[PDB]
Amino acid sequence: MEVCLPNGHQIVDLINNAFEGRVSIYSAQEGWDKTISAQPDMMVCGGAVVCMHCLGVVGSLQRKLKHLPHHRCNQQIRHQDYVDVQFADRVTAHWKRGMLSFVCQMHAMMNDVSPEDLDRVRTEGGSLVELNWLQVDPNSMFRSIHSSWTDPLQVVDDLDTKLDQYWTALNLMIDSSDLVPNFMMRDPSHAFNGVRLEGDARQTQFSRTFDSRSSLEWGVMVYDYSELEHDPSKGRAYRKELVTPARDFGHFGLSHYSRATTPILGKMPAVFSGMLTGNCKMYPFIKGTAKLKTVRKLVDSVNHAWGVEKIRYALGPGGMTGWYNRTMQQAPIVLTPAALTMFSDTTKFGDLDYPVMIGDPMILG
């Protein structure tokens, strides 16, 4: 056996899928499965098949593998060296299911509207549908304390498909109706920095990162649209005229800005792409530079494990360190789903007029 070490691009690729929850991993206990936890042995990286315990190039795409033959290994790789990545993706699975079930609940509630009250609100405004956040999946690590990352996951299929269906249907029903909920955002940059806080919101802090060093179990933070409904000088007419995100995005069938909500799960506000690209997609804002910070200990370890020739020949000039820094330059763009630039920049009802606090979810006009 003559194992080798891969190249930068595929590493970035693996980094991305880590925040994409789409990596194919093998584990004889689970084989392909990842619903439950167990140590890994081989993983894919930008199209390559790698050992997880000598981290050598053991294959690629055009040929699948089924089991590990006796190969030339080093067995110097530890769990904490990589626990971070499957850690983050287990987080991904959690949070994706959470936002998913959220959407399911929301469209289900929407799936109950009758025309009479409908027209009454259209003529009047006010609340239409309200939801209790306490009853929203306590089992989630965003909602339970005895739970953990390692907890085996829940099985669903074509989550993307159903997601898009329901985001589509729901926001279209709103579009026809032109309502305004207190849990949506036009510039989520404000969320972790750029918002006004009030009430127990004075007590929330920010890590901006996947970190077991922060509790993500938490309530859900929304606007204060109560007085908004109360405001007669900005009444039903005005309410339609300025606050409807058609002002901020136009038709939901005219998607050219990305659509974000408040920090729903674990203080995380996610955004939606535009279907006029073919389809819409949810994404939690994650800084690529953080993902860079992850690989640092690995740089060290490999410095310690392997020779200068290989790194000049595997991660090239400046070694993987020069790779680190040049990629560190490249980051703000090479790490960018397009929605990361689909932002809106004019709110026509103001936002620092309304604080954010943990209350019961709802949509009003």
Side-chain angles (χ1 to χ4, degrees), residues 224-271:
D224 190 2
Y225 285 2
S226 62
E227 72 288 49
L228 168 144
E229 183 213 78
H230 289 299
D231 294 348
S233 72
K234 275 73 68 180
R236 197 42 170 151
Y238 164 94
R239 282 186 267 264
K240 309 165 189 294
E241 296 146 23
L242 276 79
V243 191
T244 40
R247 309 312 175 284
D248 299 330
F249 309 99
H251 284 283
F252 194 56
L254 290 184
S255 60
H256 318 285
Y257 296 85
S258 201
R259 300 210 167 181
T261 73
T262 48
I264 310 301
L265 284 193
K267 293 76 65 185
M268 157 58 77
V271 199

Short mmCIF file of all heavy atoms in Angstrom, two decimals, residues 224-271:
data_model
loop_
_atom_site.label_atom_id
_atom_site.label_comp_id
_atom_site.label_asym_id
_atom_site.label_seq_id
_atom_site.Cartn_x
_atom_site.Cartn_y
_atom_site.Cartn_z
N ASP A 224 -42.28 42.80 18.44
CA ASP A 224 -43.46 43.26 19.16
C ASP A 224 -44.38 43.93 18.15
O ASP A 224 -44.28 45.12 17.87
CB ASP A 224 -43.09 44.21 20.29
CG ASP A 224 -44.27 44.51 21.19
OD1 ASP A 224 -45.36 43.94 20.97
OD2 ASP A 224 -44.11 45.32 22.13
N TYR A 225 -45.27 43.14 17.57
CA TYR A 225 -46.27 43.68 16.66
C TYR A 225 -47.62 43.89 17.33
O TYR A 225 -48.60 44.16 16.63
CB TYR A 225 -46.43 42.77 15.44
CG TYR A 225 -45.29 42.90 14.46
CD1 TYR A 225 -44.21 43.73 14.72
CD2 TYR A 225 -45.29 42.18 13.27
CE1 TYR A 225 -43.17 43.85 13.83
CE2 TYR A 225 -44.25 42.29 12.38
CZ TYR A 225 -43.20 43.13 12.66
OH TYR A 225 -42.16 43.25 11.76
N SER A 226 -47.70 43.75 18.65
CA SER A 226 -48.95 44.01 19.35
C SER A 226 -49.39 45.45 19.15
O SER A 226 -50.42 45.72 18.51
CB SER A 226 -48.79 43.69 20.83
OG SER A 226 -47.81 44.52 21.42
N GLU A 227 -48.61 46.39 19.68
CA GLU A 227 -48.86 47.80 19.44
C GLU A 227 -48.92 48.12 17.95
O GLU A 227 -49.64 49.03 17.56
CB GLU A 227 -47.78 48.63 20.12
CG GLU A 227 -46.42 48.56 19.44
CD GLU A 227 -45.71 47.22 19.62
OE1 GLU A 227 -46.34 46.16 19.41
OE2 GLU A 227 -44.51 47.23 19.95
N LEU A 228 -48.17 47.38 17.13
CA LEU A 228 -48.29 47.51 15.69
C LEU A 228 -49.74 47.36 15.25
O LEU A 228 -50.29 48.23 14.57
CB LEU A 228 -47.39 46.48 15.01
CG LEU A 228 -47.54 46.22 13.51
CD1 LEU A 228 -46.19 45.94 12.90
CD2 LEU A 228 -48.46 45.03 13.28
N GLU A 229 -50.37 46.25 15.63
CA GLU A 229 -51.80 46.10 15.40
C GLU A 229 -52.57 47.24 16.04
O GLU A 229 -53.55 47.74 15.48
CB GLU A 229 -52.27 44.76 15.95
CG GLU A 229 -53.74 44.49 15.69
CD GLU A 229 -54.38 43.68 16.80
OE1 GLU A 229 -54.69 44.28 17.85
OE2 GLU A 229 -54.56 42.46 16.62
N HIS A 230 -52.13 47.67 17.22
CA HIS A 230 -52.85 48.70 17.96
C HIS A 230 -52.82 50.03 17.22
O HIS A 230 -53.79 50.78 17.23
CB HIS A 230 -52.26 48.86 19.36
CG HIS A 230 -52.56 47.72 20.27
ND1 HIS A 230 -53.85 47.36 20.62
CD2 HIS A 230 -51.75 46.86 20.92
CE1 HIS A 230 -53.81 46.32 21.43
NE2 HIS A 230 -52.55 46.00 21.63
N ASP A 231 -51.70 50.33 16.57
CA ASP A 231 -51.47 51.61 15.92
C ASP A 231 -52.54 51.92 14.89
O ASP A 231 -52.55 51.33 13.80
CB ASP A 231 -50.08 51.63 15.28
CG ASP A 231 -48.97 51.56 16.31
OD1 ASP A 231 -49.27 51.74 17.51
OD2 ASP A 231 -47.82 51.31 15.93
N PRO A 232 -53.45 52.84 15.19
CA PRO A 232 -54.52 53.16 14.23
C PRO A 232 -54.03 54.12 13.16
O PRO A 232 -54.42 54.01 11.99
CB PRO A 232 -55.60 53.78 15.11
CG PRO A 232 -54.82 54.46 16.20
CD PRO A 232 -53.54 53.67 16.40
N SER A 233 -53.15 55.04 13.55
CA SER A 233 -52.57 55.99 12.61
C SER A 233 -51.77 55.30 11.52
O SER A 233 -51.50 55.90 10.47
CB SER A 233 -51.69 56.98 13.36
OG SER A 233 -50.50 56.36 13.81
N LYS A 234 -51.38 54.05 11.74
CA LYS A 234 -50.74 53.21 10.75
C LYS A 234 -51.64 52.03 10.44
O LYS A 234 -51.21 50.88 10.39
CB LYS A 234 -49.37 52.75 11.24
CG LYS A 234 -48.25 53.74 10.97
CD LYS A 234 -48.34 54.93 11.89
CE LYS A 234 -48.04 54.53 13.32
NZ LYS A 234 -48.13 55.69 14.25
N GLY A 235 -52.92 52.32 10.23
CA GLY A 235 -53.94 51.31 10.25
C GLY A 235 -53.88 50.35 9.08
O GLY A 235 -52.93 50.30 8.30
N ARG A 236 -54.96 49.57 8.98
CA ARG A 236 -55.12 48.53 7.97
C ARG A 236 -54.58 48.96 6.62
O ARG A 236 -53.75 48.26 6.01
CB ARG A 236 -56.61 48.18 7.86
CG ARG A 236 -56.89 46.87 7.19
CD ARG A 236 -55.91 45.82 7.66
NE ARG A 236 -56.27 44.49 7.21
CZ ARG A 236 -55.39 43.52 6.98
NH1 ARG A 236 -54.10 43.76 7.16
NH2 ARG A 236 -55.80 42.33 6.58
N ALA A 237 -55.02 50.12 6.15
CA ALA A 237 -54.53 50.66 4.90
C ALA A 237 -53.01 50.77 4.91
O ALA A 237 -52.32 50.11 4.13
CB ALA A 237 -55.17 52.02 4.64
N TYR A 238 -52.47 51.60 5.82
CA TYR A 238 -51.02 51.72 5.91
C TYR A 238 -50.38 50.37 6.12
O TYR A 238 -49.33 50.06 5.54
CB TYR A 238 -50.62 52.65 7.06
CG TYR A 238 -49.15 52.49 7.41
CD1 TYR A 238 -48.20 53.31 6.85
CD2 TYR A 238 -48.72 51.49 8.27
CE1 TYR A 238 -46.87 53.17 7.15
CE2 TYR A 238 -47.39 51.33 8.56
CZ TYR A 238 -46.46 52.17 8.00
OH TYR A 238 -45.13 52.02 8.30
N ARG A 239 -50.97 49.57 7.01
CA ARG A 239 -50.42 48.25 7.32
C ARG A 239 -50.12 47.49 6.04
O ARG A 239 -49.02 46.94 5.87
CB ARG A 239 -51.40 47.48 8.20
CG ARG A 239 -51.36 47.92 9.66
CD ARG A 239 -52.23 47.04 10.55
NE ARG A 239 -53.57 47.58 10.72
CZ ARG A 239 -53.95 48.33 11.75
NH1 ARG A 239 -53.07 48.64 12.70
NH2 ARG A 239 -55.19 48.77 11.83
N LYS A 240 -51.08 47.46 5.12
CA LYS A 240 -50.81 46.88 3.81
C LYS A 240 -49.74 47.67 3.07
O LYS A 240 -48.77 47.09 2.56
CB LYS A 240 -52.11 46.87 3.01
CG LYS A 240 -53.26 46.25 3.77
CD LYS A 240 -54.58 46.57 3.12
CE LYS A 240 -55.73 46.14 4.01
NZ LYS A 240 -55.81 44.67 4.17
N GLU A 241 -49.88 48.99 3.04
CA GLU A 241 -49.08 49.83 2.16
C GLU A 241 -47.58 49.75 2.42
O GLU A 241 -46.80 49.84 1.47
CB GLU A 241 -49.49 51.29 2.30
CG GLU A 241 -50.89 51.59 1.87
CD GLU A 241 -51.50 52.68 2.71
OE1 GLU A 241 -50.73 53.48 3.29
OE2 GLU A 241 -52.74 52.75 2.79
N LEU A 242 -47.18 49.61 3.65
CA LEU A 242 -45.75 49.75 3.87
C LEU A 242 -45.10 48.52 4.47
O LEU A 242 -43.90 48.32 4.30
CB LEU A 242 -45.45 50.95 4.76
CG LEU A 242 -45.40 52.28 4.01
CD1 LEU A 242 -46.78 52.82 3.70
CD2 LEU A 242 -44.55 53.29 4.77
N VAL A 243 -45.86 47.69 5.17
CA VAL A 243 -45.24 46.68 6.01
C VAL A 243 -45.18 45.34 5.30
O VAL A 243 -44.35 44.48 5.62
CB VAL A 243 -45.99 46.60 7.35
CG1 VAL A 243 -45.23 45.76 8.35
CG2 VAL A 243 -46.27 48.01 7.87
N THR A 244 -46.06 45.14 4.33
CA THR A 244 -46.10 43.89 3.57
C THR A 244 -44.79 43.66 2.83
O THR A 244 -44.33 44.54 2.09
CB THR A 244 -47.27 43.90 2.60
OG1 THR A 244 -47.38 45.20 2.02
CG2 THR A 244 -48.55 43.59 3.34
N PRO A 245 -44.16 42.50 3.01
CA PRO A 245 -42.84 42.26 2.39
C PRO A 245 -42.85 42.30 0.87
O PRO A 245 -41.79 42.17 0.25
CB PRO A 245 -42.47 40.86 2.91
CG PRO A 245 -43.26 40.71 4.17
CD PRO A 245 -44.56 41.40 3.90
N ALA A 246 -44.03 42.44 0.26
CA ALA A 246 -44.06 42.83 -1.14
C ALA A 246 -43.35 44.16 -1.33
O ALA A 246 -42.65 44.37 -2.32
CB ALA A 246 -45.50 42.91 -1.64
N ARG A 247 -43.51 45.07 -0.36
CA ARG A 247 -42.69 46.26 -0.34
C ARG A 247 -41.21 45.90 -0.32
O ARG A 247 -40.41 46.53 -1.01
CB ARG A 247 -43.02 47.12 0.88
CG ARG A 247 -44.48 47.43 1.05
CD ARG A 247 -45.09 47.91 -0.24
NE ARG A 247 -46.53 48.10 -0.10
CZ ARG A 247 -47.40 47.10 -0.07
NH1 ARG A 247 -46.99 45.85 -0.17
NH2 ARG A 247 -48.69 47.36 0.07
N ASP A 248 -40.85 44.88 0.45
CA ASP A 248 -39.47 44.50 0.65
C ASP A 248 -38.97 43.44 -0.32
O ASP A 248 -37.76 43.29 -0.48
CB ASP A 248 -39.27 43.99 2.08
CG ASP A 248 -39.61 45.04 3.11
OD1 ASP A 248 -39.43 46.24 2.82
OD2 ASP A 248 -40.05 44.67 4.21
N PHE A 249 -39.87 42.70 -0.96
CA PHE A 249 -39.45 41.63 -1.85
C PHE A 249 -40.29 41.52 -3.10
O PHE A 249 -39.95 40.74 -3.99
CB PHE A 249 -39.49 40.29 -1.11
CG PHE A 249 -38.76 40.32 0.20
CD1 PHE A 249 -39.46 40.48 1.38
CD2 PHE A 249 -37.39 40.19 0.24
CE1 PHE A 249 -38.80 40.52 2.58
CE2 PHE A 249 -36.72 40.22 1.44
CZ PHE A 249 -37.43 40.38 2.62
N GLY A 250 -41.39 42.25 -3.18
CA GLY A 250 -42.30 42.09 -4.29
C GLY A 250 -43.08 40.81 -4.14
O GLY A 250 -43.29 40.28 -3.05
N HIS A 251 -43.53 40.30 -5.29
CA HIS A 251 -44.25 39.04 -5.30
C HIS A 251 -43.36 37.92 -4.77
O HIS A 251 -42.17 37.87 -5.09
CB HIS A 251 -44.72 38.68 -6.71
CG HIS A 251 -45.91 39.46 -7.16
ND1 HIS A 251 -47.19 39.18 -6.72
CD2 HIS A 251 -46.02 40.51 -8.00
CE1 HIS A 251 -48.04 40.02 -7.28
NE2 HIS A 251 -47.35 40.84 -8.07
N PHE A 252 -43.93 37.05 -3.96
CA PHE A 252 -43.27 35.79 -3.66
C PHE A 252 -42.96 35.01 -4.93
O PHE A 252 -41.96 34.28 -4.96
CB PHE A 252 -44.14 34.95 -2.72
CG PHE A 252 -43.42 33.80 -2.09
CD1 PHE A 252 -42.26 34.01 -1.35
CD2 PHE A 252 -43.91 32.51 -2.22
CE1 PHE A 252 -41.60 32.94 -0.77
CE2 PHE A 252 -43.25 31.45 -1.64
CZ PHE A 252 -42.09 31.66 -0.92
N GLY A 253 -43.77 35.17 -5.97
CA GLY A 253 -43.43 34.68 -7.29
C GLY A 253 -42.47 35.55 -8.05
O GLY A 253 -42.22 35.30 -9.23
N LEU A 254 -41.94 36.59 -7.41
CA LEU A 254 -40.97 37.49 -8.01
C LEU A 254 -39.73 37.57 -7.12
O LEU A 254 -39.28 38.64 -6.72
CB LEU A 254 -41.56 38.87 -8.26
CG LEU A 254 -42.59 38.83 -9.38
CD1 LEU A 254 -43.09 40.23 -9.66
CD2 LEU A 254 -41.98 38.20 -10.62
N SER A 255 -39.21 36.40 -6.79
CA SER A 255 -38.11 36.28 -5.84
C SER A 255 -36.82 36.79 -6.48
O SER A 255 -36.33 36.21 -7.46
CB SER A 255 -37.95 34.83 -5.39
OG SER A 255 -37.68 33.96 -6.47
N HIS A 256 -36.27 37.87 -5.91
CA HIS A 256 -34.95 38.38 -6.26
C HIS A 256 -34.21 38.89 -5.03
O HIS A 256 -33.14 39.49 -5.18
CB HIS A 256 -35.06 39.47 -7.31
CG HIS A 256 -36.05 39.16 -8.39
ND1 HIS A 256 -35.80 38.26 -9.39
CD2 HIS A 256 -37.31 39.62 -8.61
CE1 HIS A 256 -36.84 38.18 -10.19
NE2 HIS A 256 -37.78 39.00 -9.73
N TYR A 257 -34.76 38.68 -3.84
CA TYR A 257 -34.06 38.89 -2.58
C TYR A 257 -34.30 37.67 -1.70
O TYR A 257 -35.32 36.99 -1.82
CB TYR A 257 -34.53 40.15 -1.87
CG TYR A 257 -34.22 41.41 -2.63
CD1 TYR A 257 -35.08 41.88 -3.61
CD2 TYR A 257 -33.06 42.12 -2.37
CE1 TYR A 257 -34.79 43.03 -4.31
CE2 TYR A 257 -32.76 43.27 -3.06
CZ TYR A 257 -33.63 43.72 -4.03
OH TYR A 257 -33.33 44.86 -4.72
N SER A 258 -33.35 37.40 -0.82
CA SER A 258 -33.50 36.24 0.04
C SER A 258 -34.34 36.60 1.26
O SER A 258 -34.30 37.72 1.77
CB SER A 258 -32.14 35.71 0.48
OG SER A 258 -32.24 34.36 0.91
N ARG A 259 -35.12 35.63 1.72
CA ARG A 259 -36.13 35.86 2.74
C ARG A 259 -35.73 35.19 4.04
O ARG A 259 -35.55 33.96 4.10
CB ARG A 259 -37.50 35.34 2.27
CG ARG A 259 -38.01 36.00 0.99
CD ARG A 259 -39.54 36.07 0.95
NE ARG A 259 -40.03 36.97 -0.10
CZ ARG A 259 -41.31 37.22 -0.33
NH1 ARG A 259 -42.25 36.64 0.41
NH2 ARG A 259 -41.67 38.04 -1.31
N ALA A 260 -35.60 35.99 5.10
CA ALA A 260 -35.10 35.55 6.39
C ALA A 260 -36.16 35.76 7.48
O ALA A 260 -37.04 36.61 7.36
CB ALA A 260 -33.83 36.30 6.79
N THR A 261 -36.04 34.97 8.54
CA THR A 261 -36.89 35.10 9.70
C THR A 261 -36.07 35.53 10.90
O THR A 261 -34.86 35.77 10.81
CB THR A 261 -37.60 33.78 10.02
OG1 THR A 261 -36.65 32.86 10.57
CG2 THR A 261 -38.20 33.20 8.77
N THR A 262 -36.73 35.59 12.05
CA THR A 262 -36.09 35.91 13.31
C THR A 262 -35.25 34.72 13.78
O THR A 262 -35.28 33.65 13.18
CB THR A 262 -37.15 36.31 14.33
OG1 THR A 262 -38.22 35.36 14.31
CG2 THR A 262 -37.68 37.71 14.03
N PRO A 263 -34.47 34.89 14.86
CA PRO A 263 -33.63 33.78 15.32
C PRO A 263 -34.44 32.63 15.89
O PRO A 263 -34.52 32.46 17.11
CB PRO A 263 -32.75 34.43 16.39
CG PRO A 263 -33.48 35.62 16.81
CD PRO A 263 -34.11 36.13 15.56
N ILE A 264 -35.01 31.82 15.01
CA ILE A 264 -36.00 30.84 15.45
C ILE A 264 -35.36 29.78 16.33
O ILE A 264 -35.57 29.76 17.54
CB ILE A 264 -36.69 30.21 14.23
CG1 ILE A 264 -37.18 31.29 13.27
CG2 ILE A 264 -37.83 29.32 14.68
CD1 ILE A 264 -38.15 32.26 13.88
N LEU A 265 -34.54 28.91 15.75
CA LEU A 265 -33.96 27.81 16.49
C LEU A 265 -32.67 28.29 17.12
O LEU A 265 -31.87 28.98 16.48
CB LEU A 265 -33.66 26.60 15.61
CG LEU A 265 -34.81 25.70 15.18
CD1 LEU A 265 -34.28 24.40 14.60
CD2 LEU A 265 -35.73 25.43 16.35
N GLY A 266 -32.47 27.91 18.38
CA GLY A 266 -31.26 28.25 19.10
C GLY A 266 -30.75 29.64 18.84
O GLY A 266 -29.54 29.80 18.62
N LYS A 267 -31.62 30.64 18.78
CA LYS A 267 -31.25 32.01 18.46
C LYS A 267 -30.70 32.12 17.05
O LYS A 267 -29.97 33.06 16.74
CB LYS A 267 -30.23 32.57 19.46
CG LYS A 267 -30.72 32.78 20.87
CD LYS A 267 -30.83 31.48 21.65
CE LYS A 267 -29.49 30.80 21.88
NZ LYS A 267 -29.64 29.46 22.54
N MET A 268 -31.04 31.19 16.17
CA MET A 268 -30.52 31.21 14.80
C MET A 268 -31.62 31.64 13.85
O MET A 268 -32.67 30.97 13.78
CB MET A 268 -29.95 29.86 14.39
CG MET A 268 -29.92 29.65 12.88
SD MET A 268 -28.96 30.91 12.02
CE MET A 268 -27.28 30.40 12.37
N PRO A 269 -31.46 32.77 13.17
CA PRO A 269 -32.36 33.11 12.07
C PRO A 269 -31.83 32.58 10.75
O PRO A 269 -30.69 32.84 10.36
CB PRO A 269 -32.38 34.64 12.10
CG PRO A 269 -31.03 35.00 12.61
CD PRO A 269 -30.59 33.90 13.54
N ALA A 270 -32.69 31.85 10.05
CA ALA A 270 -32.34 31.31 8.74
C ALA A 270 -32.99 32.16 7.66
O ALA A 270 -33.90 32.95 7.92
CB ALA A 270 -32.78 29.85 8.60
N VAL A 271 -32.51 31.99 6.43
CA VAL A 271 -32.94 32.78 5.29
C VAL A 271 -33.38 31.82 4.20
O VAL A 271 -33.01 30.64 4.21
CB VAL A 271 -31.81 33.70 4.80
CG1 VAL A 271 -32.36 34.82 3.93
CG2 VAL A 271 -31.02 34.25 5.97
#
